[PDB]
Amino acid sequence: MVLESTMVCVDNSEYMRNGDFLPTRLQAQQDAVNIVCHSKTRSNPENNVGLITLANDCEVLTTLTPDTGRILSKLHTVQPKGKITFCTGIRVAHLALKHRQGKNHKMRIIAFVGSPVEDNEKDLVKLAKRLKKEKVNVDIINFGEEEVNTEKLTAFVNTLNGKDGTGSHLVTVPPGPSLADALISSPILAG
Template identity: 30%
Template sequence: MASILAARQALTVLRSSISSSSLIHRRGLAGASELHGLKNGLKKVDSWKYPKSPFPSKEEHEIIFICVDTSKWMMRLGRYRLQVDCVRVYCRAKLKSNPRNAIGILTMGTLEKTATLETTSDFDEIRTHLRCIRALRGGELDFFEVFNSCADKLDHYPSNPKRFLFFTGGPIDFEMGEAHWYGNKFKEQGVANDVVNFFLDERFANCKMDLDAFVACTDNNNNSLIKHVPADSRTRVRDIISSLVERKKGNNEAEELLS
């Protein structure tokens, strides 16, 4: 806790001395030039046609990091099982849409930080990895630590469209205005962000509002969205994931991807 307080105090000093266009160090987050090497925006790469895909296209392949909540909060009401099922269906749909998409998995529980899967286009490898990670009692949700992990990995993909998909099942400690700040910085770097939020406890209503603000600020032409899933609902996996894959697809095409 002391280290977090110290970091926040340092942030206040840094924000007053560095221009708003710079992405400053925050909870271990690298600066803009170190983060993605994208001062002048994303560079285009060659277009491809993918003969293995049922939907050949000229879309650039996307780099996706899925951040899985392995905290104690996901052990309630079958949330963790639902989360894993969502990740599996999402990955299958993304790779079916474009076999060159690359997907990595990071964990956000404080007791499960080593279960990282480097980017891969092999669905069997993803499915095997999902069987090896789990939510742990006593672990808290460390939403910000994963930013640093993703930043380091995204340095390897300066030219590709990039996306984070966050699954959250517990409270997130955004400070006042911090959600907007993070969202704007990711938008500047061309990183889209999706959130599937299972934590709708009315006692922590500010967490929901902060996540909404984060996604709204990072959104660029509807490339980011948030899905709130009530804990007591019987929402199907397909209902959760369909909105994440159908933005550039017709309804029929999205249905086929999820089949």
């Protein structure tokens, strides 16, 4: 029963309203959260899952909890419209994992990007080097739309996991409609 707590970051935006992935991108994002929460529950019952929108407002939608019932309710009525603000959300997610009293549980972040982020690449790279010092694994699955090639995120992931680091997989949105199961397989195959 490996102990891990994951502060996932969901996305709610006009981009998320687009339904190219599955019937709706938001529904597909909810499905992706459902599998990861189930996977954490299979790995350990005590595992804590918490999520928050990284768009416009980046607070805590749900405090990390072993029970997944709160996670499902937060996914319901997510309401999408805010422009993505990944930099504020990523900083909040890393510190929030430290905030949890049970720091013994392994700390991981899974995020969904629905829109291009208007941030200096150096600024996110500086956050990524700080994230590397924090040594908390972050894997991001881009959903529906993303900055072309997620170039800033690819550099951010490399800065986050450089020098033979975890190299947590970064999933650029598959072009056009993507099956949720196709999205789920890459994180299950490797972090």
